[PDB]
mmCIF file of C-alpha atoms and ligand atoms in Angstrom:
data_model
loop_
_atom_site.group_PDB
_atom_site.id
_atom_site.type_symbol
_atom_site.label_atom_id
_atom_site.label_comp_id
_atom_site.label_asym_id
_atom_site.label_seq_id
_atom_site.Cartn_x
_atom_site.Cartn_y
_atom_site.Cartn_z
ATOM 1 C CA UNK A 14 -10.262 -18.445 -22.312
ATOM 2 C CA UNK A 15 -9.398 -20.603 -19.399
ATOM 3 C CA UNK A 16 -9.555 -18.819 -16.158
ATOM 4 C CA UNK A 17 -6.688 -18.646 -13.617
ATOM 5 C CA UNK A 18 -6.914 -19.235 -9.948
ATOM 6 C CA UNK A 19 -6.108 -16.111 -7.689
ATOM 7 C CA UNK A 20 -3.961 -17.691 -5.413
ATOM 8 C CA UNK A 21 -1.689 -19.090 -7.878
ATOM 9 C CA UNK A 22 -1.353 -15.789 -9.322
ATOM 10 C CA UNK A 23 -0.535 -14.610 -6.296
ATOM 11 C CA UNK A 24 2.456 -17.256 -5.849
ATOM 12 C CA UNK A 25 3.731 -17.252 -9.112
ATOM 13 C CA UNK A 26 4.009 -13.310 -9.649
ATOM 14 C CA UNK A 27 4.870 -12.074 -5.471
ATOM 15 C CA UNK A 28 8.090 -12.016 -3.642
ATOM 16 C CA UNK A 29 7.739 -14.856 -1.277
ATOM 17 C CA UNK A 30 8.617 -12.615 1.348
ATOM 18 C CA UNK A 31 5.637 -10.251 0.602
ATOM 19 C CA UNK A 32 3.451 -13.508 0.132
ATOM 20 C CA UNK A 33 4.215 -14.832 3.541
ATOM 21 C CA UNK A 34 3.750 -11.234 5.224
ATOM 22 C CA UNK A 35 0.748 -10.927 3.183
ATOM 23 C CA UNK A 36 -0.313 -13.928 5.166
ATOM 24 C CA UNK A 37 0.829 -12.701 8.447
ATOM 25 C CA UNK A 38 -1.796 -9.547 7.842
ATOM 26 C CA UNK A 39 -4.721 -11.950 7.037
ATOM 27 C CA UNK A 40 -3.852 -14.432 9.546
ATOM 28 C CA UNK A 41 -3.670 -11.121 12.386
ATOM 29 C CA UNK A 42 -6.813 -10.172 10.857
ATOM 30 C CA UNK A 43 -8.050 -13.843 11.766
ATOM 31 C CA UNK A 44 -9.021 -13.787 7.440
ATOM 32 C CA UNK A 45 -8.474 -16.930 5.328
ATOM 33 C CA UNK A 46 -6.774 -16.631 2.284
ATOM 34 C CA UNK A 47 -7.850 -19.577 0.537
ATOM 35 C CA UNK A 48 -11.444 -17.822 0.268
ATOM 36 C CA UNK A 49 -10.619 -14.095 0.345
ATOM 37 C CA UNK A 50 -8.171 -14.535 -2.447
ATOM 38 C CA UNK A 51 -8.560 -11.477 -3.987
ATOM 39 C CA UNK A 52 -7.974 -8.787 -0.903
ATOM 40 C CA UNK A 53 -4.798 -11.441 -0.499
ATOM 41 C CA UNK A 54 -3.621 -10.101 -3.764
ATOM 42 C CA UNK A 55 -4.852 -6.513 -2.751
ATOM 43 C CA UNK A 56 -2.392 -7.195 0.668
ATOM 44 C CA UNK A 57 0.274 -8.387 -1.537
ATOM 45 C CA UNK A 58 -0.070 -5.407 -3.887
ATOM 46 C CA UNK A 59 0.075 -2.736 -1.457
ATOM 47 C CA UNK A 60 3.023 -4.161 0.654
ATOM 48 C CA UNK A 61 4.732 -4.615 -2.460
ATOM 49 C CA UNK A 62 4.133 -0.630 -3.564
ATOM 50 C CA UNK A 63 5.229 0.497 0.095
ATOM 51 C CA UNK A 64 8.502 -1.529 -0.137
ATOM 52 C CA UNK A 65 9.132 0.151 -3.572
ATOM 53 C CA UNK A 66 8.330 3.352 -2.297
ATOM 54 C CA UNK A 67 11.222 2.999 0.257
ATOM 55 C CA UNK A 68 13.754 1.363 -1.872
ATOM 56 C CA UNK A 69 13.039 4.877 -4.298
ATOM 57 C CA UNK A 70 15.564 5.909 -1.718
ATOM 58 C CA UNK A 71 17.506 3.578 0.860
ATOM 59 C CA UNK A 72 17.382 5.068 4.504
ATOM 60 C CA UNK A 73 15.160 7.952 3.645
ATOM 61 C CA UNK A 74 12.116 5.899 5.063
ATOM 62 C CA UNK A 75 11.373 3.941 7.689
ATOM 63 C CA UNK A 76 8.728 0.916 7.166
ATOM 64 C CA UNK A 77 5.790 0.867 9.604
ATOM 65 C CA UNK A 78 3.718 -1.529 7.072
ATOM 66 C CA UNK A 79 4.173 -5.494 7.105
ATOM 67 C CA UNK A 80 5.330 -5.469 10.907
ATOM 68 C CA UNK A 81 3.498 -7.057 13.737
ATOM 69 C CA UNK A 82 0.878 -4.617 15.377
ATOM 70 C CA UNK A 83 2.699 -4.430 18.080
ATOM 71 C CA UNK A 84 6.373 -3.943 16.924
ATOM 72 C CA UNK A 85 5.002 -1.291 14.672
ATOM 73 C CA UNK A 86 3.412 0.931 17.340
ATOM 74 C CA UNK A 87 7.183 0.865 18.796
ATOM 75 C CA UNK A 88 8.659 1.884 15.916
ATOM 76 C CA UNK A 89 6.391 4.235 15.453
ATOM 77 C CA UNK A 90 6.827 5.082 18.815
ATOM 78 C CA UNK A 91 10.414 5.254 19.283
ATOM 79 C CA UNK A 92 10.371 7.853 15.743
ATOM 80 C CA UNK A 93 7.954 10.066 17.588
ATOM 81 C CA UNK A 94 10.444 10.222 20.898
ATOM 82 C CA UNK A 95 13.634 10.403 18.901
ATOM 83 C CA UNK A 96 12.713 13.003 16.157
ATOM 84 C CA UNK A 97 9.674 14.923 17.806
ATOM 85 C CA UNK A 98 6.865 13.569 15.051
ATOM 86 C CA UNK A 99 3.674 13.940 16.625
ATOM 87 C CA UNK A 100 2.093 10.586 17.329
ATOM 88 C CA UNK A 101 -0.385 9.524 14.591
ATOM 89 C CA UNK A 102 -3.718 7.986 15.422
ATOM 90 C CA UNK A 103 -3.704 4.945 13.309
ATOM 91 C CA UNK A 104 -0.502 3.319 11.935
ATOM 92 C CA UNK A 105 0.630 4.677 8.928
ATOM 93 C CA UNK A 106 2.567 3.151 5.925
ATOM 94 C CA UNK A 107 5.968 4.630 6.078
ATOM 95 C CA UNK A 108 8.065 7.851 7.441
ATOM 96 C CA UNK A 109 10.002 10.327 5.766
ATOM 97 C CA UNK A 110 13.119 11.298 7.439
ATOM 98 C CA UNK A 111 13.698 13.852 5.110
ATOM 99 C CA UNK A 112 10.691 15.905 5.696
ATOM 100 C CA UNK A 113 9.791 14.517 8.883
ATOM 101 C CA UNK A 114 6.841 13.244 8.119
ATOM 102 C CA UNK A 115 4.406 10.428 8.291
ATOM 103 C CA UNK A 116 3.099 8.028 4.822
ATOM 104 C CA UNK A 117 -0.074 6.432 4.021
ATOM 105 C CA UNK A 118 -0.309 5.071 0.786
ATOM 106 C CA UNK A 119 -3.254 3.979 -0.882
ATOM 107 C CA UNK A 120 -3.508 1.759 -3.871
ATOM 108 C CA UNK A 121 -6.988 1.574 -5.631
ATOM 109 C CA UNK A 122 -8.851 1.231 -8.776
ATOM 110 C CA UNK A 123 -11.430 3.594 -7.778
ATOM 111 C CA UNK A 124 -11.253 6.776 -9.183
ATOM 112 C CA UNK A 125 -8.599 8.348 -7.016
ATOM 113 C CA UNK A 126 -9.927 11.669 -5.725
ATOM 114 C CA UNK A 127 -12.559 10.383 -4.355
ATOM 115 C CA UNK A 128 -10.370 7.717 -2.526
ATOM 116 C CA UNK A 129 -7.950 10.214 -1.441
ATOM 117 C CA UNK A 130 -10.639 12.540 -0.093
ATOM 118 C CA UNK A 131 -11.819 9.106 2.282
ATOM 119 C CA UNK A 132 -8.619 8.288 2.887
ATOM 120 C CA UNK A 133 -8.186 11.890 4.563
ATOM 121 C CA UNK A 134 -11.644 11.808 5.827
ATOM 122 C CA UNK A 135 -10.552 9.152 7.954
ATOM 123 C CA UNK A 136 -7.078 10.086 8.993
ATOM 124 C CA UNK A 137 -8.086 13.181 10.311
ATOM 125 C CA UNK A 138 -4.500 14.250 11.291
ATOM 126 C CA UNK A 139 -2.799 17.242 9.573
ATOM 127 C CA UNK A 140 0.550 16.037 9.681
ATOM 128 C CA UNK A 141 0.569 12.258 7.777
ATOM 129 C CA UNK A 142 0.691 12.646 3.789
ATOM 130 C CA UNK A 143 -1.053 10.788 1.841
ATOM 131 C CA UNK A 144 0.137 9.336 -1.486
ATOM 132 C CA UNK A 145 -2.736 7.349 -3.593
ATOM 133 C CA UNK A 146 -1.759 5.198 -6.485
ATOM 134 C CA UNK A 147 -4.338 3.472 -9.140
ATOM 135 C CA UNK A 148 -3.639 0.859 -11.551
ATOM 136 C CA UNK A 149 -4.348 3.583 -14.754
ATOM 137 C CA UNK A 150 -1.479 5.371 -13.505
ATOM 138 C CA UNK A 151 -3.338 8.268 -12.348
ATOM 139 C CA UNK A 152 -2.267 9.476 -8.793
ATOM 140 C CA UNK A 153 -3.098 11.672 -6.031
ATOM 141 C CA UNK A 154 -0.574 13.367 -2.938
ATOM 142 C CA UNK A 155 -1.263 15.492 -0.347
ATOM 143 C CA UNK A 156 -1.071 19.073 -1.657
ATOM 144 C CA UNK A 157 -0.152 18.089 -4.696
ATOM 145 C CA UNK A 158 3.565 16.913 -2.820
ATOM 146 C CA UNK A 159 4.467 13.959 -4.863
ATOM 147 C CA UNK A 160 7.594 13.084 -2.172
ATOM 148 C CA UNK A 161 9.347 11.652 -4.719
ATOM 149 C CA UNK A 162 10.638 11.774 -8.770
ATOM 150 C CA UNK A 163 8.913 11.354 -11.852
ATOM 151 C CA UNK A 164 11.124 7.646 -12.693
ATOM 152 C CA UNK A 165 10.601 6.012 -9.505
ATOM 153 C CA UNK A 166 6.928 6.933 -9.190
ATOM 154 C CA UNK A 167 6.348 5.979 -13.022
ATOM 155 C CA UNK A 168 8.648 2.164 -11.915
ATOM 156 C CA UNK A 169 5.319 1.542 -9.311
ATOM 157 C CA UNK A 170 3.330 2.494 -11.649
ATOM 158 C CA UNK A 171 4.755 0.214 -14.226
ATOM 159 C CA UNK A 172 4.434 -2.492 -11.941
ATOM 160 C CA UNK A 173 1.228 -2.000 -10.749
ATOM 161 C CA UNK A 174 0.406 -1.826 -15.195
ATOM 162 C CA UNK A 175 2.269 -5.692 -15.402
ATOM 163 C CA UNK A 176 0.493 -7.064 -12.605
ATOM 164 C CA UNK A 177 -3.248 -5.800 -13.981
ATOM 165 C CA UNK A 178 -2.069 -7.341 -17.362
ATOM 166 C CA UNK A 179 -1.351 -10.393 -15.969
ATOM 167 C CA UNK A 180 -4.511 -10.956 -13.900
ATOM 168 C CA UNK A 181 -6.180 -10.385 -17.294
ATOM 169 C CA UNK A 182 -4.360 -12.326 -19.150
ATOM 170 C CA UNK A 183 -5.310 -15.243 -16.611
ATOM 171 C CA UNK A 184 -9.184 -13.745 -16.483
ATOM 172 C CA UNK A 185 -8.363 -12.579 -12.923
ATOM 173 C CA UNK A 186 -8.793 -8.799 -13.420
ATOM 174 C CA UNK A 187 -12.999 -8.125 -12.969
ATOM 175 C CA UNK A 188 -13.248 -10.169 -10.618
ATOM 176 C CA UNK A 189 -10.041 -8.605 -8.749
ATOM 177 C CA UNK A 190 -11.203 -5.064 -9.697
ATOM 178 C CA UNK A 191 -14.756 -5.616 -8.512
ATOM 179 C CA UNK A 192 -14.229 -6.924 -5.238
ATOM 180 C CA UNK A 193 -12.479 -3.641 -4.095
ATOM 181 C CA UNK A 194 -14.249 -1.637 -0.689
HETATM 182 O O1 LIG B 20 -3.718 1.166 2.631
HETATM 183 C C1 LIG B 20 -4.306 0.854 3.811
HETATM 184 C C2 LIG B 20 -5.691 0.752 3.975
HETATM 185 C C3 LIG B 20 -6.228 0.432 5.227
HETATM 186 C C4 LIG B 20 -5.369 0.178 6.299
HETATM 187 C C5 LIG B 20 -5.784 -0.135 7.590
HETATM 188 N N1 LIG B 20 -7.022 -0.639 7.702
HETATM 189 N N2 LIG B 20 -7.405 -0.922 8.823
HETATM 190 C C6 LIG B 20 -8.635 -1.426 8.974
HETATM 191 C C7 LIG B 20 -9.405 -1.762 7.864
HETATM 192 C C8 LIG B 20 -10.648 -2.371 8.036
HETATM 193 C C9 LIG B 20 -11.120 -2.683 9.307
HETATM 194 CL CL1 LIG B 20 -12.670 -3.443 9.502
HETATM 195 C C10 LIG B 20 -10.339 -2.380 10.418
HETATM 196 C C11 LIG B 20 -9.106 -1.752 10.246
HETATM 197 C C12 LIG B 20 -4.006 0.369 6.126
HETATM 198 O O2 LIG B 20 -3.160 0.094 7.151
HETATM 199 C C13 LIG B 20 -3.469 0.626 4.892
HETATM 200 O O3 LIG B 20 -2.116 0.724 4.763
HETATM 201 O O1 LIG B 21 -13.466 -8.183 0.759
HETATM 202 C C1 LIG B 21 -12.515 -7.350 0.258
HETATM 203 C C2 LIG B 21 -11.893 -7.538 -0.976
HETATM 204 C C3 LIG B 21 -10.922 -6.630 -1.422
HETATM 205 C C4 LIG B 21 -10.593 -5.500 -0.656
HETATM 206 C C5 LIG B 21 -9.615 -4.576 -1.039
HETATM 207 N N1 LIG B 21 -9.410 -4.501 -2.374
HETATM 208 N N2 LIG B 21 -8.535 -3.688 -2.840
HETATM 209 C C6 LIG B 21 -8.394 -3.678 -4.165
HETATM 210 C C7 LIG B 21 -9.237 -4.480 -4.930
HETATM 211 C C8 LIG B 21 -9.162 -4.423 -6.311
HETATM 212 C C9 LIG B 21 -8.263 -3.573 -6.943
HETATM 213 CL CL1 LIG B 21 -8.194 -3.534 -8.663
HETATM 214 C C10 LIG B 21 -7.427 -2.757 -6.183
HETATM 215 C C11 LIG B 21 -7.487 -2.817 -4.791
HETATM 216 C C12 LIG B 21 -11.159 -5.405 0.614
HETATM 217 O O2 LIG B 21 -10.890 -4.312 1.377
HETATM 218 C C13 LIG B 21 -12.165 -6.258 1.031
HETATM 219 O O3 LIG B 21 -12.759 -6.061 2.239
HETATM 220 MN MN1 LIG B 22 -0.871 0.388 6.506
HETATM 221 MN MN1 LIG B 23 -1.739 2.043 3.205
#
């Protein structure tokens, strides 16, 4: 029927918090929203799953993602110094207290393995777990380590379902699904 636009999609169904950090990354990136509209709602989605993934238990992680560059490396920083974390080449995501550990986390609709496997191409570093999510639900962790339960995991997922059911519903979902990588 009548096709949506992306952007207000975007401001109707995002935390205006995530929106505006969402902007902060494209605006550090030097990108404009108003044309990449798509990877704006990709940003969005992804910030959104990494603050889920830490409110799946308060003060178990710390948030690296949706900081400034800068403030992030000291954070990250400061977590190597303070608990003896070795330093990880590119920023991550999040970190576990509780196993003392880096995050990245992924969210794709490519198939997932093969994602994960580039994902950990790239990261080369043994000690940051990865944790890959895809809008079909299917998901992929770093040795099968799934960090944390079966209801929080399956409350991302369900959002991640309502938000690809939406953009269809508006006629938003090829184009969104398409213009991954
Ligand atoms: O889920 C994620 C996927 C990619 C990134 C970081 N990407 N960084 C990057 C991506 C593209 C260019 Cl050209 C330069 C740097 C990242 O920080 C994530 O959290
Ligand atoms: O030009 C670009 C447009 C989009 C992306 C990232 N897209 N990520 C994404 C895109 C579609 C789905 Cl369904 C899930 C994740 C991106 O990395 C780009 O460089
Ligand atoms: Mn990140
Ligand atoms: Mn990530």
């Amino acid at each position: 029927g009548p096709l949506g636009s992306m952007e207000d999609f975007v401001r109707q169904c995002f935390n205006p918090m995530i929106v505006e950090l969402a902007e902060k990354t494209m605006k550090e990136y030097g990108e404009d929203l108003k044309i990449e509209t798509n990877k704006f709602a990709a940003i969005c989605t992804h910030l959104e799953v990494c603050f889920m993934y830490s409110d799946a238990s308060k003060h178990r992680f710390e948030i690296i993602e949706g900081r400034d560059r800068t403030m992030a490396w000291t954070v990250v920083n400061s977590i190597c110094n303070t608990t003896g974390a070795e330093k990880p080449k590119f920023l991550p995501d999040l970190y576990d207290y509780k196993e003392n550990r880096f995050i990245e986390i992924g969210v794709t609709r490519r198939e997932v393995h093969i994602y994960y496997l580039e994902k950990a191409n790239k990261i080369k570093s043994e000690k940051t777990h990865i944790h890959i999510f895809s809008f079909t639900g299917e998901e992929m962790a770093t040795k099968a380590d799934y960090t944390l339960d079966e209801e929080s995991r399956a409350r991302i997922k369900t959002r991640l379902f309502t938000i690809r059911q939406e953009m269809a519903s508006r006629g938003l979902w090829d184009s969104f699904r398409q213009s991954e990588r």
